[PDB]
Write a protein that binds this ligand. Structure first.
Ligand code: ATP
Ligand code: ATP
Ligand code: GAR
Ligand code: GAR
Ligand code: CL
Ligand code: CL
Ligand code: CL
Ligand code: CL
Ligand code: MG
Ligand code: MG
Ligand code: MG
Ligand code: MG
Ligand code: NA
Ligand code: NA
Lengths: 384, 386
């Protein structure tokens, strides 16, 4: 691995496709290595742009626009930070010689619930929920019958529950199908003891895992996350096995977020993000290398070696709901202290619910860490 | 404490005067809280400029130039990152309403050895080396004669060991003086034969004075080469060092993190000098603590309570200090410079013309000895080309 000096002719260039809080941390990690960072997003002054060398505002779903930006900057690494990008152009560009992290195919496959679910369930032969594909209210209708209730519905092009529907009732199918709007996937409910994110890094020295991350979701948003999630060694063994198979099948170097359901000693694969994952923001205080630092280490072709975990830790989001273009944060003095920090993203405005920052905490117990982080997030007064 | 959103009208604005590797991390910690950062230096594309919202290049020793940039950017905080700045202008501006971190008087006393040395020794009655000042060669010679051999001569305004000479005999007198003219008044100090030297990173904040665990360090050519933490000290030595550091910071005044350099002789502690801001040796804290010295400086100056500092165990830093001339530096063999419990930082400095600290290796281990070896070895593996 040879790195140039940012801004100099031999500079090593990284292009972020998506500049939110996740990309912000990736950017800092690149910067820490003198790596040149070009932050791209669909709006100006996105978090990652504040810490990048330069930025571009474009419609990332527009393949032609993406090719132009890429051609213009000639990056050595194309690092997707969100799902919503023109994966097809990534494939083409990769084919043209461009380095897409972890690989273009992994981006495409995971973007579509159909590709990924078939790969894992079928090809890889791993445990998943019961599933089905349909392409019409009729098909929806007949599928949802196949699944039965309880049951889940998601566009094959859904995120953060975007267009998802939890179906216990026949009445919903009015709502359901419309909300889903295209085409969809219908899954049969898993009753797990808990869910985890197994952050798995694929690098030159093989695949390494972070301690399991537990989390609480609410209204399609993670609220809190913690590490390490308590689970059996047997269960952990199984989870690791599932994660390795998945990451190796997707291919390429990077940090992946493997979503799994845990039922006693059994583990079931749900999905996977071929990039750093929100719940993993706890690693900003819980490990020597954050998931962001791990991603960069991996993609640059550098070895990981190991990952140190610093005891019970948690993250708790700062998720206000208001409309403003000049947000201020008061009472900060009561949101920081021993074993407690906060991050404020730099998002330019808000109009509805939006993740503007995160609280991070460590404690003697996971329960205590969660509380310290939750309390700290609650102390911040978000003004408009 | 209220913070705005960077780039927005109510933004909280921080101006760094000096944009080296130290300011770079201060900038990153500001950015992590959505603090708007303006990076100023004497050259373009300085490290902190890479991670700042806006940058400016001016003569920081020119008070009028300083006033123009501050007037232009209207920062809420002026955060000097180096000693060589127009400190009288900072006093002026502070009077005019600006918040200078930690305070303008602290910057003024420490930018010139005479201010701080006389304060510490004379006013605070802290233990220090013997010393004399001199502004002519003849007086310099009288000074050396009174001080005795060996002694160290240094320009009153200097850092990283520039213009200094370890004087062992009269034979060096002439070149030493000259050389102290390349890098004005000078200080002549008696040599303290210490067992080891430390940097006690001391944070003065809204919730009091807090101390990081002692950071040991090895200097060469008066420039740091390796640092580690914790440095073992007797209970008595640690208590004395803390007392000294507490006195210095409170005397200098204002919130911020200060790098208090001390010499240790068994259970006795002697004061050397202090940075009224993050310290180079303190870069070990990038791996060794929950909150790095940069994060602590920011926390403090923003008026937030520190609460406490967590130390992860034995760790060390080792500099990446090549020697060449180039304006297009590359770093190869990076795959042999990082791994388990091992990291590096490459600063983004635009060029080199001789020796220049371009990066740092960081490591953790079960002992500082092992940590130091791992960091040194990694720094060494880096293939610097240009
Ligand atoms: N078959 C299922 N059984 C039980 N719960 C499920 C199932 N499918 C999804 N969930 C629940 O829905 C949550 C979000 O749905 P899912 O992870 O499948 O996709 P998503 O909405 O696109 O989220 P993401 O933002 O991670 O892409 C999961 O974290 C889990 O709590
Ligand atoms: N009186 C003294 N006795 C013994 N050693 C000393 C004395 N003064 C300085 N040194 C040695 O030289 C090193 C550098 O000296 P000093 O800190 O004064 O220089 P500097 O140019 O101000 O460096 P910087 O500001 O970057 O720390 C010390 O850390 C110590 O190793
Ligand atoms: N759950 C996915 C996730 O956390 N994505 C993160 O949020 C950004 C968008 O935030 P925004 O919608 O507020 O602009 C993305 O850019 C990414 O950093
Ligand atoms: N002990 C002082 C010290 O470490 N100063 C650090 O070195 C920079 C200058 O480096 P440069 O000479 O390579 O430009 C300063 O800006 C500061 O960060
Ligand atoms: Cl592992
Ligand atoms: Cl300095
Ligand atoms: Cl960090
Ligand atoms: Cl190799
Ligand atoms: Mg998804
Ligand atoms: Mg999910
Ligand atoms: Mg000094
Ligand atoms: Mg010194
Ligand atoms: Na690749
Ligand atoms: Na002040």
């Amino acid at each position: 691995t040879l790195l140039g000096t940012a801004l100099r002719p031999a500079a090593t260039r990284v292009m972020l496709l998506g500049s939110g809080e996740l990309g912000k941390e990736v950017a800092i990690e690149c910067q820490r290595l003198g790596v040149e960072v070009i932050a791209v997003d669909r709006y100006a002054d996105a978090p990652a742009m504040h810490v990048a060398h330069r930025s571009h505002v474009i419609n990332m779903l527009d393949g032609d626009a993406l090719r132009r930006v890429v051609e213009l900057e000639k990056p050595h690494y194309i690092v997707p930070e969100i799902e919503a990008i023109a994966t097809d152009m990534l494939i083409q560009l990769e084919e043209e010689g461009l380095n897409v992290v972890p690989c273009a195919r992994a981006t495409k496959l995971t973007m579509n619930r159909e590709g990924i679910r078939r790969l894992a369930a079928e090809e890889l032969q791993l445990p998943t929920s019961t599933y089905r594909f349909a392409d019409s209210e009729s098909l929806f209708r007949e599928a949802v019958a196949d699944i039965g209730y309880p049951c889940i519905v998601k566009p094959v092009m859904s995120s953060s529950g975007k267009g998802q529907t939890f179906i216990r009732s026949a009445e919903q199918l009015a709502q359901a199908w419309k909300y889903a709007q295209g085409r969809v996937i219908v899954e049969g409910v898993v009753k797990f003891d808990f869910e985890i994110t197994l952050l798995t890094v694929s690098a030159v020295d093989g695949v390494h895992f972070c301690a399991p991350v537990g989390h609480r979701q609410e209204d399609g948003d993670y609220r809190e996350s913690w590490q390490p999630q308590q689970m059996s060694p047997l269960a952990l063994e199984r989870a690791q096995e599932i994660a390795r198979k998945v990451v190796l099948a997707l291919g390429g170097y990077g940090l992946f977020g493997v979503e799994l359901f845990v039922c006693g000693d059994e583990v079931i694969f749900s999905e996977v993000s071929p990039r750093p994952h929100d719940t993993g923001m706890v690693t900003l205080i819980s490990q020597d290398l954050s998931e962001f630092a791990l991603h960069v280490r991996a993609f640059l072709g550098l070895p990981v070696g190991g990952i140190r975990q610093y005891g019970p830790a948690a993250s708790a989001v700062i998720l206000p709901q208001l409309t403003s273009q000049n947000v201020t944060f008061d009472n900060v003095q009561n949101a920081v202290g021993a074993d407690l920090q906060i991050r404020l993203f730099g998002k330019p405005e808000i109009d509805g619910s939006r993740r503007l920052g995160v609280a991070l905490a460590t404690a003697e117990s996971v329960v205590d860490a969660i509380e310290r982080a939750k309390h700290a997030a609650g102390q911040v007064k978000v003004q408009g």
